[PDB]
Structures are given as structure tokens and as C-alpha cells.
Amino acid sequence: ATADTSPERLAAIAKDALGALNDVILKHGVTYPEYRVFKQWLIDVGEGGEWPLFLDVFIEHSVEEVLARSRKGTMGSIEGPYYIENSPELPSKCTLPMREEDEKITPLVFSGQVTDLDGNGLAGAKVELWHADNDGYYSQFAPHLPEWNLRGTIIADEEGRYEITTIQPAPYQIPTDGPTGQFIEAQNGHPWRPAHLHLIVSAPGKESVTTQLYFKGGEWIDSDVASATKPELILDPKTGDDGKNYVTYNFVLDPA
Amino acid sequence: ATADTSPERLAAIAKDALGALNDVILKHGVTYPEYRVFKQWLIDVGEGGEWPLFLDVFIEHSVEEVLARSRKGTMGSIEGPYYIENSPELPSKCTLPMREEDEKITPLVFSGQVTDLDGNGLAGAKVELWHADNDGYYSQFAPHLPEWNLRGTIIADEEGRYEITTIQPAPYQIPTDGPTGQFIEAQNGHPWRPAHLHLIVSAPGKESVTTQLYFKGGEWIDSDVASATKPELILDPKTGDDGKNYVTYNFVLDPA
């Protein structure tokens, strides 16, 4: 990864970031035993491979918030740590790859349209969808799962429409025993994110959008540990007589 | 390491530390490519074993500053990452262990007295001294060095006096190729600390003091990368006719 940040921009960011942290130590009278625990815990974060988790939980929301200012289309949200590029392509009307341990979960039928700022529908539009199973696991991050379980890139039709059947994911829990979970536990927090779909939506000559969608009534929408929920992103699915849940959600893309 | 910090104290520290960092992202409009570089660099810090270095350079000074408020005796300074417990004991009048590559350096004769707040001299007082050689290396952190090179615990006499001959350390440079050095290089900084002695001074029923001493005229006293220099800690050694440099410095210990 590379960034085009100047020495002077970096200096300025570093000065107030370190200044700020040093200010917090002063305000709170952080002790030497505390400093020692902090040092060991930073070591533990790295040793446990949790920098992607910790940052995406506690920092990414502010980086999306910056990006949001430059965008007129659908609300973005954090990518989080579980995205995988090049998920297998599926047609506009499709069902995500899934196991038999998944086919017993009430189906979720997700429909809608990808458009521009003026509402023109968009051909060649792709919807990359990934989410957790009813167990709260992601494929490629749980060795029991078929590697593209609940992952796909949907090819939207000429009008920019799709109909994807999947399942509702379970809420996600941050493993309690790792450094991040221990950080949360030690301050009496909840290591939970509400149930959510991840989507990256793209189209020719359009700026892609990374977002998440949530479920009205879901537990933890009011207390997402990653501060990544937005009211605009909450789905209210209706139940059909097949007993499946139906929801329509449209994507609006900024020009590239 | 353990600390006795409450869930509520931890919550409060975390809230403003993360809040502060998220505020810096917002103020500066930190980008996704920047966020990605930041994430990789945190990973690299851990992989390179540089959490002790980075924190002691950029954070420890604030933790000593907190501790300083509760102390009436000699000014403290940061421990930094190179302290080693149980260095071999030496008598009140002694010379630090050193090589032949060290005996060619002009000697530094360091004298003084350990006392209490009222100026009463202190028996059973110990002066743990450690510093770098003329090359800027520390023993146990450079495989060529005898493991206690320029390290000792000095036993002060009945009056609390010592006379330790050593050498003046060279200034210290933070390795430029590691994540911390690369952090410094990318913002156009200087990876240098002024030449310094480290001391931990202790006595029966007294609160030990961790401090450093610096050298008038030394380069980088005006720009210590670790912000750990204080005017009270700067030595002005006088040259004798043996051509050795002489300095007197007294330690004043708070009661335990």
C-alpha cells in the first residue's frame, strides 16, 4: 500500500495524533503500570494478527466518514476485514453459493436497481455481496466453509436490476479472548456488531461504493461496536406467503 | 504486566484516545490509501519488534511527566528500551566495565551524593548506570559487546557518595530502516537522541528515580526525538590536567 502524502502533511497528522495521545495520558494521569500494560497489549494485537480487526472496528468508520463528504450517492459504510476480491460471478437473478447447513434458514430475497445521480439505470453493473452465515462465520475465515459460501459478484441486467436470494446473516461477535476482545471486556463493553450484508457496487465510469445493510429490529443496531451503522442503511424486509423475507434496495453511484 | 485500572477508568481513557484519533482523521481528511498505509505500518511495527522503541520515543515522556507531579526530588526522565536489571555491583569508587575499543575514549569521572529531601545523605544507596559506547551501541543489544559493557550497579558509601569513571556516550540514532525510522524519514525528521547517561537511583525506604543526564553543548539537546531532555539534567563537565572530564551530580530521593 502506498499513499501520496507529503512529508508536511504526514508531519502535521503525526503531530496532532501523538500530541492528542500524550494529552490523554496527561489528562488521565496514566501510570507506569498502565503504560506497561498498554505496551504489552500493542505487542499482543500484532502477535494475534488483529491489526485489521482492531482498526476496522475502532478507526475505519472515521475514514468512511471523510470519504462520505465527497459522495452524493448511496451511503457508504466500512469495508471491515472480511472482503475478498474476485468472488464468482452470478446472473442478475441468482442465489448466493451456500451449504445445506444454510438452506434451513429462512431465505432473504434481495432486489433492486443500480442507477446514477439523475436516476438513470446502469448497464454492466456489478454487486459484490458478502456476509456471514447463521453461525456468524465468514468463508475463508472459517476452515469448515466452502471458500465462496455467501460470496458472489452479481451481474446486474441492462436496466441495472438484480434479484439475489440468500439468508439473513447472524449478528457478528468479536472473539472475546483476543487482544481486541480483551480490550472490550476490560472496559465492560459488548463485542457485537448487528447482522449485516456487505456490498461493493460498481459500474462503467462510476465510482464504486462500499456499504453495509442492516435489519430493522435487529439486536445491536443501536450499539454497533464498530460505529458503522447508519439509519439510511437499515432494511425492513416483508414476509411473503412462501414465508421468505423480501426486501428492495436501490444503489445510486457517483461518477468516477 | 498488570494494572489496577477500573473498567470505568479504562472506558474513559479509551473513549478520549479513540475519539481523539478519529478527530485527527476528520480534521485532516485522512484517505483510504492513507488508512491502508497506516494499517500496514502498525503491522510492520509489531513484526519488527519495535513497539518498545516507538512507544518509549513518542509516548513515555508523557508518562514520566505524570509521575513527575508526585515527586519533589531530582528530575526524572524516561527509562527508554535499553535498561537491564541486576547489572554487577561495584564499589562507591569504581570504573564501569568496558572494552579496549572503549579505553581510548576520553574518560568521564562522575561524582556526587545521594540524599533525601532535607539533604540528609543516604547509606545503602545504589546507582544503576547504563549508557551507550562511542559507537552508540548498548550491551545486550549489540552481539559484539560484553554483556555488561558500560552497565553497573554502584554501591554508594555511608554518606551516599560515589565516584564512577566511564566514558561519554555518543548520541543515539534510531535505525532508519525500521518502521519507526521510516515513520521519522517520511515526515522529514531527525532520528537522533542527544548523548545521555541513564540512571536508576534507589535507597532504603526511598522511592527510586529513573533519570537521564545530558552534556552541555551536545548535539540534539535542542531536538531530542524522544522529547526526554530537561534543562535540569544537563551536565557541564570540566576538563582536568589528566585530560579527563569531571562532573559532579547529586541525587535527591523522595520517601517511599
Ligand SMILES: Oc1cc(Cl)c(Cl)cc1O
Ligand atoms: O465486517 C465486519 C467489520 C468489523 Cl469491524 C467486524 Cl468486528 C465484523 C465484521 O463482520
Ligand SMILES: Oc1cc(Cl)c(Cl)cc1O
Ligand atoms: O534510552 C533510549 C530511549 C530511546 Cl526512546 C531511544 Cl530512541 C534511545 C535510547 O537510548
Ligand SMILES: [Fe+3]
Ligand atoms: Fe461483516
Ligand SMILES: [Fe+3]
Ligand atoms: Fe539510551
